[PDB]
Nucleic acid binder design. Structure first.
Lengths: 97, 83, 109, 95, 97, 83, 109, 95, 109, 95
DNA sequence: GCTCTAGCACCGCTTAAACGCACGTACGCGCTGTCCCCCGCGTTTTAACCGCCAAGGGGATTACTCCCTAGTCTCCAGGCACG
């Protein structure tokens, strides 16, 4: 029998690894494609500094980890551990938008 | 030239890595498209501002300086590219 | 017969400029006139904050047995400190990540 | 050569040489420190301007920044900041 | 038996009446004396006009009531109609205190 | 002259009426203590700020103008008292 | 010998003051100089915003069968517009109370 | 002998009579309008000052406060305010 | 014809006298030469010591709500600190008494 | 006629008012601080003299007291004292 | 330094607020079943990353020259004080 870790153990190992980690968690070129796409929605043929793509990356992921920290608090509030769309809607409604 | 679907380019395991950075253990299957949506909406919120500075500057190229200015306008001030 | 150009920061006994801070107060357009205590006082509070956070950064780096300061050490240093956290709640550090702050029930038993 | 992009470079290295002679500095951490000094200077200068308009004062001296430090920086850091700022302004008066 | 409503019906009437209401919810004199209590806790011999007492009043119901919309959104998130303190400090933490 | 414990002067039914404006149906008996505590915390912050404003102005009477300045600073801007 | 004294707001055809807002910006310390179209534009923006909120205030007074506007009507007007709430979400109101907002599970049955 | 207090009294009353001639006005609502005008004026002024800071412009222009209207004023009221401001400056420079 | 008088304490930004300690090290007869940084170094050290202990004594005086420092406040201040206890284990304090120190077995029950 | 007896009067008063403006002094406490500063001074001075004998240097520099304060003063107290003296001597050499 | 005015201090009725007890009903939640749904791991694909090379759009700088804007003197007229 091949060895199999229990559900959640590899999840906690990912948690510990990625809290210890500091690197980017998004592939950079599809992110750049997406931000050029949404820039084209508002103004055509805009150009991006690669550092500007990195800044939008880090601000975006910081926003996401703040929202996910909020939804973890919402999930442990709801006697649960699986985060739900109602948790994300709650966190955004609390934060005032 | 024109791009139609790169919101799916932010992959589901990449969102999983982000949520592990957020300390999430268990993520529902309906979460990922909603995270795409809220990151999307946040990108209009940021980039309309950033494009607005850019068109004030009579420029065509997005700079990180205006990214910092847009993020600090919303009270989410970003260290690491100002100055 | 002019006197020697001696620095106002050393007149404060400090290192953050009275000159640059006074210049960015004048050209930041915050008041018509600026008192002389203003830039020395504000340079002093920045030097206090800087010394405190690089103290915590150096201790964080030596805790991780590393020599050169990294924004991981900086972000760790900021959110060990309660009043720094209350100062910088809405600010995000580049490449700093998140300090390990793991809620207890999601940890295994 | 290019035009000078002004920063807080040598100041952060000398204050580190005061507080920790042996540790080094990365460029990312130095950019973080530059943006920190920019943010805190902007907050204190803006609140000083607010107190200038609020008391109908065209003058901003150390007393309004002492007011602003008591406003923004909480508690322990506030009274610490007032202490070394008062020492700094006294050595300024004694030149 | 005398007249008596089921639990919540009078509560609904209270909710409707004071969402309709525009007048003040808290007493004036103990509020002013509490302001004085905090005042001499910081600097003695501090005085207040009645308008300033009204201003701190208005700020108090604004802040507290806003915490109650945040709080009962938390409470309906937890599938409950009875609120508990953990809703209040979790809401204060999400707000970013 | 000096007072000790007037914090219960904000009575429990006042808190109930506040939560009725806040639309809370059921208010536990445990609730009133932390409502008084957070009200103490918020007023401690606001009156600290306001006292700092007045002591800057070298006065001995708090104006409502300084109160609305303190509400400008802390991010709860209030309308209607000469701000 | 002199031109007739003419108000700049009526030159722009607006009621809101070109002069008072221009002087208040010039003494408000936001720059050293102000463009000529800047306070005209600002007065137009403020007159538009006040026109919208007073139109909704008159609508609220007519709904309450009252002739004079009350800050209750003003809070009713602001909270019933989504984009003004996006403008004034963090602003607290004097004697306005709360908008009628009963939740789905808060309602009985 | 008392001092004059500057307000927006008859101006808001005039635009009130333009939008609703038959209605009245209370003093508490007038405090609300005065603080509202002050707060929105301050928000626009602050964002215009910051925008002039960012693009090294030492003057406040109608273009950059129009930019500020796109920034602070959201959505459809933003383009209504753009229409109002451009119309206003059009009949202003034609005057 | 002469430079204006500046004390070395003002040059170092200290308010303990640099010259007094320099004299008292010359006439304390500890070496025939003394480096110039030595007395200002020592005065700064005593400045840190006295500032530390006057923080402690003033805080203790506030804790017993008395306005003036007393040797009882000083003796509480020294004895409630560990490193000052090592620094002054063999030191007698006049009218300072003893720190409140009851052993666990001396308590009833 | 009286002969003046030297003490540490105004220095302890000034440093107390710099750390606590609203806290008073009793004279017996003032004698305790006089004896404290005299005691610690003679401790450091005797240790410095012994070091000068010990390394056969005919001088006591800042480095001798730097050595002596990790000798007598403990740890964080000593390292804070070293930092205070280091910034003090840099200000002295700058003046 | 003056002054004058609303807050501070003190005074006297009035039931509304508070409060407290008691009946009553609903409230939260644990056990446990039950159903279900997403993580772990293996395998396969595929473009991300690397790394390598061409090209040109515009960011940024320098200069020019002119648009504009605060300031000031002065004058008058509508908003504020006052009723």
């Amino acid at each position: 029998k091949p060895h199999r870790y229990r559900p959640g153990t590899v999840a906690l190992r990912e948690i510990r690894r990625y809290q210890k980690s500091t690197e980017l968690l998004i592939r950079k070129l599809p992110f750049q494609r997406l931000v050029r796409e949404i820039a084209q929605d508002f103004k055509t043929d805009l150009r991006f500094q690669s550092s500007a793509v990195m800044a939008l990356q880090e601000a975006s992921e910081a926003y996401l980890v703040g929202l996910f920290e909020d939804t973890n608090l919402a999930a442990i509030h709801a006697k649960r551990v699986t985060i739900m769309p109602k948790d994300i809607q709650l966190a955004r409604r609390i934060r005032g938008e | 030239k024109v791009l139609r679907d790169n919101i799916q380019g932010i992959t589901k395991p990449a969102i999983r890595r982000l949520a592990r950075r957020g300390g999430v253990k268990r993520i529902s299957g309906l979460i990922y498209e909603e995270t795409r949506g809220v990151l999307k909406v946040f990108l209009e919120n940021v980039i309309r501002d950033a494009v607005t500075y850019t068109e004030h500057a009579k420029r065509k190229t997005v700079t990180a300086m205006d990214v910092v200015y847009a993020l600090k306008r919303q009270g989410r001030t970003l260290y690491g590219f100002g100055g | 017969a002019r006197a020697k150009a001696k620095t106002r920061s050393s007149r404060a006994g400090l290192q953050f400029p009275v000159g640059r801070v006074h210049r960015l107060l004048r050209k930041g357009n915050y008041s018509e006139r600026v008192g002389a205590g203003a830039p020395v006082y504000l340079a002093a509070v920045l030097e206090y904050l800087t010394a405190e956070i690089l103290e915590l950064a150096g201790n964080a780096a030596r805790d991780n047995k590393k020599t050169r300061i990294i924004p991981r050490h900086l972000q760790l240093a900021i959110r060990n400190d309660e009043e720094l956290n209350k100062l910088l709640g809405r600010v995000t550090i580049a490449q700093g990540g998140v300090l390990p702050n793991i809620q207890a029930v999601l940890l295994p038993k | 050569k290019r035009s000078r992009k002004e920063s807080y470079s040598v100041y952060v290295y000398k204050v580190l040489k005061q507080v920790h002679p042996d540790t080094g500095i990365s460029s990312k951490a130095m950019g973080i420190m530059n943006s920190f000094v920019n943010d805190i200077f902007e907050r204190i200068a803006g609140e000083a301007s607010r107190l200038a308009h609020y008391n109908k004062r065209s003058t901003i001296t150390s007393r309004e920044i002492q007011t602003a430090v008591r406003l923004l920086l909480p508690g322990e850091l506030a009274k610490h900041a007032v202490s070394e700022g008062t020492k700094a302004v006294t050595k300024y008066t004694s030149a």
